[PDB]
Amino acid sequence: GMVDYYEVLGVQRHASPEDIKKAYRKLALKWHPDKNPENKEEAERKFKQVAEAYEVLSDAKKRDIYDKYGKEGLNGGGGGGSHFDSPFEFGFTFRNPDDVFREFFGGRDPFSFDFFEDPFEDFFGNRRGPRGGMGNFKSISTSTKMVNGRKITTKRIVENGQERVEVEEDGQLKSLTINGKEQLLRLDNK
């Protein structure tokens, strides 16, 4: 009948490889972890499914199998009674969906721009930019002590060459300094 991966892509069984590429790219954005983190439940599940769907469905070796079977799947060739040459299952494991998207996109929004959607030009940091960026951290020094029953924690965080000191008391930020310039926390109403 049809291959379930088509339903994952949201297309018809007669969709071309190029149309598979379309759905793949579109859904890569649509259900991207950073696109819809609010519904991470539906997003994660479908996002990962898309990885599998694309990789397998787009494989000519699997298409050969599907053509033999008639898109029947379970023992399709036997049920249909077909006689075509096809590749065999050799105990192949499942691939990390994240690695799939890493290969083809880099784990990033397919429809993003390096000149317009610059991660390092984002006040809020909703483009995988600095301020919590992986590989951007040089070194973090953490030291905690007890003062009059109070938990005093000081963190020296170096990121992108910039140093910021964070001093907390019982889990509450008391002082914050950036490159020797103390910032006023009273301005932070987030």
- Sole residue written with tokens 């799939």: 100
Handedness of CA 28, 109, 99, 14 (dihedral sign): positive
Domain boundaries, the chain: 1-116, 117-190
Report the C-alpha gap between 101 and 25 in whole angstroms. Answer: 9
DSSP-assigned beta bridge partners for residue 157: 140, 164
Neighbour tally for 43: CB within 10 Å: 18
| Encoded amino acid at 167, one letter | V
| Phi then psi dihedrals of residue 41, to 5 deg | -70, -60
Q: How deeply is 182 buried, as exposed, middle or buried, from its count of CB atoms within 10 A (0-12, 13-18, 19+)?
A: exposed
| Encoded amino acid at 98, one letter | D
Q: Are 145 and 119 in contact (CB under 8 A)?
A: no
144 alpha-carbon distance from chain centroid: 34
Q: Are 98 and 86 in contact (CB under 8 A)?
A: no
Solved by what technique? NMR
Q: Are 116 and 125 in contact (CB under 8 A)?
A: no
First-to-last CA distance in the chain? Answer: 54
Report the C-alpha gap between 178 and 13 in whole angstroms. Answer: 57
Q: Are 151 and 171 in contact (CB under 8 A)?
A: yes
DSSP-assigned beta bridge partners for residue 143: 154
